[PDB]
Amino acid sequence: MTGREILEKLERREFTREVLKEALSINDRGFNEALFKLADEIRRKYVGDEVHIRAIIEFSNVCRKNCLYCGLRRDNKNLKRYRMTPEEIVERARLAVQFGAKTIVLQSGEDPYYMPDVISDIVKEIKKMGVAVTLSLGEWPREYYEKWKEAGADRYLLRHETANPVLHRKLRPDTSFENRLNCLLTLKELGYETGAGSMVGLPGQTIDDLVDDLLFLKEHDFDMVGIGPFIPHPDTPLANEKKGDFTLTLKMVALTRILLPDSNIPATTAMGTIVPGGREITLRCGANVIMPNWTPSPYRQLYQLYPGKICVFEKDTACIPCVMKMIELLGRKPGRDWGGRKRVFET
Ligand SMILES: C[C@H](CCC(=O)NCCC[N+](C)(C)CCCS(=O)(=O)[O-])[C@H]1CC[C@H]2[C@@H]3[C@H](O)C[C@@H]4C[C@H](O)CC[C@]4(C)[C@H]3C[C@H](O)[C@]12C
Ligand SMILES: C[C@H](CCC(=O)NCCC[N+](C)(C)CCCS(=O)(=O)[O-])[C@H]1CC[C@H]2[C@@H]3[C@H](O)C[C@@H]4C[C@H](O)CC[C@]4(C)[C@H]3C[C@H](O)[C@]12C
Ligand SMILES: C[C@H]1O[C@@H](n2cnc3c(N)ncnc32)[C@H](O)[C@@H]1O
Ligand code: MET
Ligand code: SF4
Ligand code: FES
Ligand SMILES: [C-]#N
Ligand SMILES: [Fe+2]
Ligand SMILES: [S]
Ligand SMILES: [S]
């Protein structure tokens, strides 16, 4: 199909595998810009001009897993490990609420020390502040996810990473795509707003894999989708692999918006890392959420999922005002409420 025919089918919501594979395989600049324009317009029509701010506190870099791409993998001995205390986490969350954050995201390595009861206590304290709480702690038993929901957690971010089960198992040797999906379905059944999403440009990943990632996200109708390029980390087995391509990752964001028009889609930190200004571009091609770093020094510099992570050298209250300025220079508006998904039911 020509690029014009693909766009026509995308505008008519004819989301066949062939259409998605062709959209990802055409590299014509005119096609790409029309695709970005379509996703930008779909975003504006369904989710409006508000860009929702989710303040992230990366509260521990301890991890029991050994994912091949991740700088926090347990075999990396070239890393100072840290754990914030529950009081530090709660008071850091309070400072973010004082700065205007309406969602607090708690993210960590899979660190058993807090699980499940310390997390529940922290969540209860933060919920007293009248904000949304999102957890991103990895794979844990249903009993833990249930305790955290009863403590008040609203959302859970568990990126599916890759929908190809063979690749998933080789990159995440402790677990499987089957377990990852089971976790996501459990999270949805418990009432969380649930976030999935993948990396783009993983070693061995093909365009057919990316199409499957899109169809996976569409199949389960996730409330949030977090997408970013793979960035190789020197202290991992993938150190010598190529980084993911920014334009291809941006096309995945755009297609995700076109497929899931009312979903919440961040312009991820990784997008800001591989290309200067990458998050701002992504907010104009389908994304509607930004997640400023609210981890305090001296820990912020130690949460090294991939190298070059932006925000590391800024003062540690800098990132919320920075994204507020970003939203204004983009001609967008701050989110007024918690920014939960607002479903538009269609046909
Ligand atoms: C800012 C630059 C270059 C200026 C430009 O191409 N803008 C057209 C008007 C030209 N001007 C009126 C400024 C000069 C005319 C008088 S003059 O005689 O001086 O030429 C333009 C050129 C291509 C544009 C992107 C693409 O679309 C894809 C995508 C569409 C989304 O929806 C919004 C995001 C995104 C990334 C766009 C952003 C931005 O928009 C770009 C970079
Ligand atoms: C934390 C300290 C001390 C006072 C305090 O503890 N203040 C709690 C405010 C709680 N809220 C944010 C919920 C109020 C929102 C009311 S509002 O009318 O905005 O809806 C206060 C004093 C001055 C406040 C900044 C400035 O003002 C400029 C700017 C306004 C933006 O907008 C939000 C970001 C920013 C940087 C502000 C952040 C923060 O707040 C500051 C630092
Ligand atoms: C928290 C999210 O960080 C992403 N993540 C982890 N390691 C990398 C990397 N090297 N490059 C890009 N993204 C990564 C995963 O998608 C993970 O779920
Ligand atoms: C720090 S990676 C994100 C949180 C969790 N460890 C996961 O892999 O899903
Ligand atoms: S991706 Fe998450 S689970 Fe895997 S090593 Fe990194 S922190 Fe641990
Ligand atoms: S959030 Fe923008 S540079 Fe830190
Ligand atoms: C992540 N943003
Ligand atoms: Fe993220
Ligand atoms: S930042
Ligand atoms: S920013």
Side-chain angles (χ1 to χ4, degrees), residues 1-3 5-7 10-36 38-76 78-79 81-86 88-169 171-241 243-303 305-314 316-332 334-335 337-347:
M1 273 178 276
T2 68
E5 283 163 344
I6 291 301
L7 290 157
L10 290 176
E11 300 200 58
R12 289 185 269 120
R13 325 222 119 235
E14 307 181 1
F15 299 132
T16 64
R17 177 184 295 279
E18 174 185 27
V19 166
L20 297 177
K21 178 167 190 176
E22 225 124 76
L24 290 170
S25 302
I26 299 174
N27 297 317
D28 178 77
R29 183 176 303 282
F31 174 82
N32 283 348
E33 297 182 356
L35 175 68
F36 300 145
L38 174 62
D40 194 31
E41 207 69 22
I42 293 285
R43 181 281 299 165
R44 197 170 12 239
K45 295 190 296 190
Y46 280 86
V47 303
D49 281 344
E50 293 179 21
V51 172
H52 294 293
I53 297 177
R54 329 293 208 182
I56 306 181
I57 301 165
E58 298 153 331
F59 66 86
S60 168
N61 70 349
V62 174
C63 197
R64 67 185 175 168
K65 280 189 166 53
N66 212 27
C67 309
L68 268 62
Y69 44 82
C70 184
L72 311 193
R73 65 198 308 269
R74 64 162 186 275
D75 283 352
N76 182 12
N78 191 24
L79 178 61
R81 305 285 175 161
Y82 70 91
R83 285 173 173 151
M84 290 174 66
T85 70
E88 276 176 313
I89 301 170
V90 168
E91 295 311 311
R92 185 70 178 176
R94 199 179 315 278
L95 190 68
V97 176
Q98 288 169 6
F99 270 69
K102 294 166 179 301
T103 297
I104 301 305
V105 179
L106 303 179
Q107 189 181 81
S108 62
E110 287 196 9
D111 180 356
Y113 173 76
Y114 302 83
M115 316 298 184
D117 292 336
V118 180
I119 297 301
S120 298
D121 296 332
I122 288 162
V123 167
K124 293 177 199 179
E125 289 311 305
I126 294 170
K127 286 299 287 179
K128 292 181 191 178
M129 309 172 186
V131 298
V133 167
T134 296
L135 300 178
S136 185
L137 310 183
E139 298 176 28
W140 296 98
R142 176 189 181 96
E143 163 215 327
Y144 292 13
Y145 291 162
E146 190 172 8
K147 290 183 179 189
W148 299 336
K149 190 75 179 64
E150 293 172 356
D154 299 281
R155 324 199 178 109
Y156 202 104
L157 181 59
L158 185 77
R159 293 169 67 185
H160 75 272
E161 317 296 12
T162 170
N164 181 316
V166 172
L167 185 64
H168 195 113
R169 172 67 176 183
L171 299 178
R172 312 189 65 244
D174 304 287
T175 184
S176 65
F177 172 75
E178 173 184 13
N179 197 66
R180 199 76 170 179
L181 171 59
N182 170 262
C183 293
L184 281 165
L185 301 177
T186 296
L187 290 166
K188 291 185 66 191
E189 177 200 325
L190 287 175
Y192 286 88
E193 297 201 344
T194 303
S198 47
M199 290 172 283
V200 174
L202 292 162
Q205 193 180 39
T206 64
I207 295 296
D208 288 317
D209 289 330
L210 299 182
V211 177
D212 287 343
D213 282 321
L214 294 174
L215 298 167
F216 173 82
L217 300 166
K218 178 71 164 169
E219 166 183 1
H220 303 284
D221 190 40
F222 294 105
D223 306 298
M224 313 100 75
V225 181
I227 291 175
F230 164 64
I231 303 169
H233 190 299
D235 302 321
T236 66
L238 306 185
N240 299 324
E241 300 294 330
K243 69 183 171 181
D245 179 75
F246 177 77
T247 302
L248 184 65
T249 308
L250 189 65
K251 296 176 69 169
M252 289 286 293
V253 167
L255 286 163
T256 297
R257 168 66 62 200
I258 291 160
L259 284 158
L260 296 178
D262 59 20
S263 60
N264 279 322
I265 295 174
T268 62
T269 317
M271 288 300 257
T273 298
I274 57 156
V275 160
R279 295 171 301 172
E280 295 87 330
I281 291 159
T282 307
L283 287 170
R284 302 180 70 167
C285 297
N288 72 313
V289 169
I290 191 102
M291 318 191 32
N293 193 305
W294 201 248
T295 306
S297 49
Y299 310 130
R300 181 181 292 173
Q301 66 195 100
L302 302 177
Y303 197 87
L305 301 175
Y306 40 84
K309 284 214 9 171
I310 53 173
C311 314
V312 162
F313 290 80
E314 315 280 308
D316 63 30
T317 66
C319 305
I320 288 174
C322 184
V323 307
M324 282 169 177
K325 176 197 200 300
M326 180 195 294
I327 293 161
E328 178 67 15
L329 66 94
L330 290 173
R332 299 278 274 281
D337 57 16
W338 290 0
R341 184 182 172 187
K342 287 173 181 60
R343 288 179 174 272
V344 183
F345 300 115
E346 330 181 18
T347 59

Coordinates of all heavy atoms in Angstrom, one line a residue, residues 52-92, unseen atoms left out:
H52 N -0.7 15.8 32.0 CA -0.7 15.4 33.4 C 0.6 15.1 33.9 O 1.4 14.5 33.3 CB -1.6 14.2 33.5 CG -3.0 14.5 33.2 ND1 -3.8 15.3 33.9 CD2 -3.7 14.1 32.1 CE1 -5.0 15.4 33.3 NE2 -5.0 14.7 32.2
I53 N 0.9 15.6 35.1 CA 2.2 15.6 35.7 C 2.2 14.4 36.8 O 1.4 14.5 37.7 CB 2.6 16.9 36.4 CG1 2.7 18.0 35.3 CG2 4.0 16.8 37.2 CD1 3.0 19.4 35.8
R54 N 3.1 13.5 36.6 CA 3.2 12.4 37.6 C 4.6 12.5 38.2 O 5.6 12.2 37.5 CB 3.0 11.0 36.9 CG 2.1 11.0 35.7 CD 0.6 11.3 36.0 NE -0.3 10.7 35.0 CZ -1.6 10.8 35.1 NH1 -2.1 11.6 36.0 NH2 -2.4 10.2 34.2
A55 N 4.7 12.8 39.4 CA 6.1 13.0 40.1 C 6.6 11.6 40.5 O 5.9 10.9 41.3 CB 5.9 13.9 41.3
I56 N 7.7 11.2 40.0 CA 8.3 9.9 40.3 C 9.3 10.0 41.4 O 10.2 10.9 41.4 CB 9.0 9.3 39.0 CG1 8.1 9.3 37.8 CG2 9.5 7.9 39.3 CD1 8.8 8.7 36.6
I57 N 9.2 9.1 42.4 CA 10.2 8.9 43.4 C 10.7 7.5 43.2 O 10.0 6.5 43.4 CB 9.6 9.2 44.8 CG1 9.0 10.6 45.0 CG2 10.7 8.9 45.9 CD1 8.1 10.7 46.2
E58 N 12.0 7.4 42.8 CA 12.7 6.1 42.6 C 13.3 5.8 43.9 O 14.4 6.3 44.2 CB 13.7 6.3 41.5 CG 13.0 6.7 40.1 CD 13.9 7.5 39.2 OE1 14.8 8.2 39.8 OE2 13.8 7.5 38.0
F59 N 12.6 5.1 44.8 CA 12.9 5.0 46.2 C 13.9 4.0 46.6 O 14.4 4.0 47.7 CB 11.7 5.0 47.0 CG 10.9 3.7 46.9 CD1 11.2 2.5 47.6 CD2 9.8 3.6 46.0 CE1 10.5 1.3 47.5 CE2 9.2 2.4 45.8 CZ 9.5 1.3 46.6
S60 N 14.2 3.0 45.7 CA 15.2 2.0 46.0 C 15.7 1.4 44.7 O 14.9 1.2 43.8 CB 14.6 0.8 46.7 OG 15.5 -0.3 46.8
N61 N 17.0 1.2 44.5 CA 17.6 0.6 43.3 C 18.0 -0.8 43.6 O 18.7 -1.4 42.7 CB 18.7 1.5 42.8 CG 20.0 1.4 43.6 OD1 19.9 0.9 44.7 ND2 21.1 1.9 43.1
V62 N 17.6 -1.4 44.7 CA 17.9 -2.8 44.9 C 16.9 -3.6 44.1 O 15.7 -3.4 44.0 CB 17.7 -3.1 46.4 CG1 17.7 -4.6 46.7 CG2 18.7 -2.3 47.3
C63 N 17.5 -4.7 43.4 CA 16.7 -5.6 42.6 C 17.1 -7.0 42.7 O 18.3 -7.3 42.7 CB 16.6 -5.2 41.1 SG 15.2 -6.0 40.3
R64 N 16.2 -7.9 42.9 CA 16.4 -9.4 42.9 C 16.4 -10.0 41.5 O 16.9 -11.2 41.4 CB 15.3 -10.1 43.7 CG 13.9 -10.0 43.0 CD 12.8 -10.6 43.9 NE 11.5 -10.4 43.2 CZ 10.4 -11.0 43.6 NH1 10.4 -11.9 44.7 NH2 9.2 -10.8 43.0
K65 N 16.0 -9.3 40.5 CA 16.0 -9.8 39.1 C 17.2 -9.4 38.3 O 18.0 -8.5 38.8 CB 14.7 -9.3 38.4 CG 13.5 -10.2 38.7 CD 12.3 -9.8 37.9 CE 11.2 -10.9 38.0 NZ 10.7 -11.2 39.4
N66 N 17.4 -10.0 37.1 CA 18.7 -9.9 36.4 C 18.4 -9.6 34.9 O 19.1 -10.0 34.0 CB 19.5 -11.2 36.5 CG 21.0 -11.0 36.5 OD1 21.5 -9.9 36.8 ND2 21.7 -12.0 36.1
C67 N 17.4 -8.8 34.7 CA 17.1 -8.4 33.3 C 18.3 -7.9 32.5 O 19.0 -7.1 33.1 CB 16.0 -7.3 33.2 SG 14.5 -7.7 34.2
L68 N 18.5 -8.4 31.3 CA 19.7 -8.2 30.6 C 20.0 -6.8 30.2 O 21.1 -6.4 30.0 CB 19.8 -9.1 29.4 CG 20.4 -10.5 29.5 CD1 19.7 -11.4 30.6 CD2 20.5 -11.2 28.2
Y69 N 18.9 -6.0 30.0 CA 19.0 -4.6 29.6 C 19.2 -3.6 30.7 O 19.6 -2.5 30.4 CB 17.7 -4.2 28.8 CG 16.4 -4.6 29.4 CD1 15.8 -3.9 30.5 CD2 15.8 -5.8 29.0 CE1 14.6 -4.3 31.1 CE2 14.6 -6.2 29.6 CZ 14.0 -5.5 30.7 OH 12.9 -5.9 31.3
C70 N 18.9 -4.0 31.9 CA 18.7 -3.0 33.0 C 20.0 -2.8 33.8 O 20.5 -3.8 34.3 CB 17.6 -3.5 33.9 SG 17.2 -2.3 35.2
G71 N 20.4 -1.5 34.1 CA 21.5 -1.3 34.9 C 21.3 -1.6 36.4 O 22.3 -1.7 37.1
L72 N 20.1 -1.8 36.9 CA 19.9 -2.3 38.3 C 19.8 -3.8 38.4 O 19.6 -4.3 39.5 CB 18.5 -1.7 38.8 CG 18.2 -0.2 38.6 CD1 17.0 0.1 39.5 CD2 19.4 0.6 39.0
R73 N 20.1 -4.5 37.3 CA 20.1 -6.0 37.4 C 21.0 -6.5 38.5 O 22.1 -5.8 38.8 CB 20.5 -6.6 36.1 CG 22.0 -6.3 35.7 CD 22.2 -6.6 34.2 NE 21.7 -7.9 33.8 CZ 22.5 -9.0 33.8 NH1 23.8 -8.9 34.2 NH2 22.0 -10.2 33.4
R74 N 20.7 -7.6 39.2 CA 21.3 -8.0 40.4 C 22.8 -8.3 40.2 O 23.6 -8.1 41.2 CB 20.6 -9.1 41.1 CG 20.6 -10.4 40.3 CD 20.3 -11.7 41.2 NE 20.5 -12.9 40.4 CZ 19.6 -13.4 39.6 NH1 18.4 -12.9 39.5 NH2 19.9 -14.4 38.8
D75 N 23.2 -8.7 39.0 CA 24.6 -9.0 38.8 C 25.5 -7.8 38.6 O 26.7 -7.9 38.6 CB 24.8 -9.9 37.6 CG 24.5 -11.4 37.8 OD1 24.3 -11.8 39.0 OD2 24.5 -12.2 36.9
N76 N 24.9 -6.6 38.5 CA 25.7 -5.4 38.4 C 26.3 -5.0 39.8 O 25.6 -4.4 40.6 CB 24.9 -4.2 37.8 CG 25.8 -3.0 37.6 OD1 27.0 -3.1 37.7 ND2 25.1 -1.9 37.3
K77 N 27.6 -5.3 40.0 CA 28.2 -5.0 41.2 C 28.9 -3.6 41.2 O 29.3 -3.1 42.2 CB 29.3 -6.0 41.6 CG 28.8 -7.4 41.6 CD 29.9 -8.4 42.0
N78 N 28.9 -2.9 40.0 CA 29.4 -1.6 39.8 C 28.4 -0.5 40.1 O 28.3 0.5 39.4 CB 29.9 -1.5 38.3 CG 30.7 -0.2 38.1 OD1 31.3 0.4 39.0 ND2 30.8 0.3 36.8
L79 N 27.6 -0.7 41.1 CA 26.5 0.3 41.4 C 26.3 0.4 42.9 O 26.2 -0.7 43.6 CB 25.3 -0.2 40.8 CG 24.0 0.7 41.0 CD1 24.3 2.1 40.5 CD2 22.8 0.1 40.4
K80 N 26.3 1.6 43.5 CA 26.0 1.8 44.9 C 24.5 1.6 45.0 O 23.7 2.3 44.4 CB 26.4 3.2 45.3 CG 26.0 3.6 46.7 CD 26.8 2.9 47.8
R81 N 24.1 0.6 45.8 CA 22.7 0.4 46.1 C 22.2 1.3 47.3 O 22.9 1.6 48.2 CB 22.4 -1.0 46.4 CG 22.9 -2.0 45.3 CD 22.0 -2.0 44.1 NE 22.6 -2.9 43.1 CZ 22.0 -3.4 42.0 NH1 20.7 -3.2 41.8 NH2 22.7 -4.2 41.2
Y82 N 20.9 1.8 47.2 CA 20.3 2.6 48.2 C 18.9 2.2 48.5 O 18.2 1.6 47.6 CB 20.4 4.1 47.8 CG 19.5 4.5 46.7 CD1 18.2 4.9 46.9 CD2 19.9 4.4 45.4 CE1 17.3 5.2 45.9 CE2 19.1 4.7 44.3 CZ 17.8 5.1 44.6 OH 16.9 5.4 43.5
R83 N 18.4 2.5 49.7 CA 17.0 2.4 50.0 C 16.6 3.7 50.8 O 17.2 3.9 51.8 CB 16.8 1.2 50.9 CG 16.8 -0.1 50.2 CD 16.8 -1.3 51.3 NE 16.6 -2.6 50.6 CZ 17.1 -3.7 51.1 NH1 17.7 -3.7 52.2 NH2 16.9 -4.8 50.4
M84 N 15.6 4.4 50.3 CA 15.0 5.5 51.1 C 14.2 4.9 52.2 O 13.6 3.9 52.1 CB 14.1 6.4 50.2 CG 14.9 7.2 49.2 SD 13.8 8.1 48.1 CE 13.0 9.3 49.1
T85 N 14.2 5.6 53.4 CA 13.4 5.1 54.5 C 11.9 5.5 54.2 O 11.7 6.4 53.4 CB 13.8 5.8 55.8 OG1 13.5 7.2 55.8 CG2 15.3 5.6 56.0
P86 N 11.0 4.8 54.9 CA 9.6 5.2 54.6 C 9.3 6.6 55.0 O 8.5 7.3 54.3 CB 8.8 4.2 55.5 CG 9.8 3.0 55.8 CD 11.1 3.7 55.8
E87 N 9.9 7.1 56.0 CA 9.7 8.6 56.4 C 10.3 9.5 55.3 O 9.6 10.5 55.0 CB 10.4 8.9 57.7
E88 N 11.4 9.2 54.7 CA 11.9 10.0 53.6 C 11.0 9.9 52.4 O 10.8 10.9 51.7 CB 13.3 9.4 53.1 CG 14.5 9.8 53.9 CD 15.8 9.1 53.4 OE1 15.7 7.9 53.3 OE2 16.8 9.8 53.2
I89 N 10.5 8.7 52.1 CA 9.6 8.6 51.0 C 8.3 9.5 51.2 O 7.9 10.2 50.3 CB 9.2 7.2 50.7 CG1 10.6 6.4 50.4 CG2 8.3 7.1 49.5 CD1 10.4 4.9 50.3
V90 N 7.7 9.3 52.3 CA 6.4 10.1 52.6 C 6.7 11.6 52.5 O 6.0 12.3 51.9 CB 5.8 9.6 53.9 CG1 4.7 10.6 54.4 CG2 5.3 8.2 53.8
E91 N 7.8 12.0 53.2 CA 8.0 13.5 53.2 C 8.4 14.0 51.8 O 8.1 15.1 51.5 CB 9.0 13.9 54.3 CG 8.5 13.6 55.7 CD 7.0 14.2 55.9 OE1 6.8 15.4 55.6 OE2 6.2 13.4 56.4
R92 N 9.1 13.1 51.0 CA 9.4 13.5 49.6 C 8.2 13.6 48.8 O 8.0 14.6 48.0 CB 10.4 12.5 49.0 CG 10.9 12.9 47.7 CD 11.8 14.2 47.8 NE 12.3 14.5 46.5 CZ 13.0 15.6 46.2 NH1 13.4 16.4 47.2 NH2 13.4 15.8 44.9

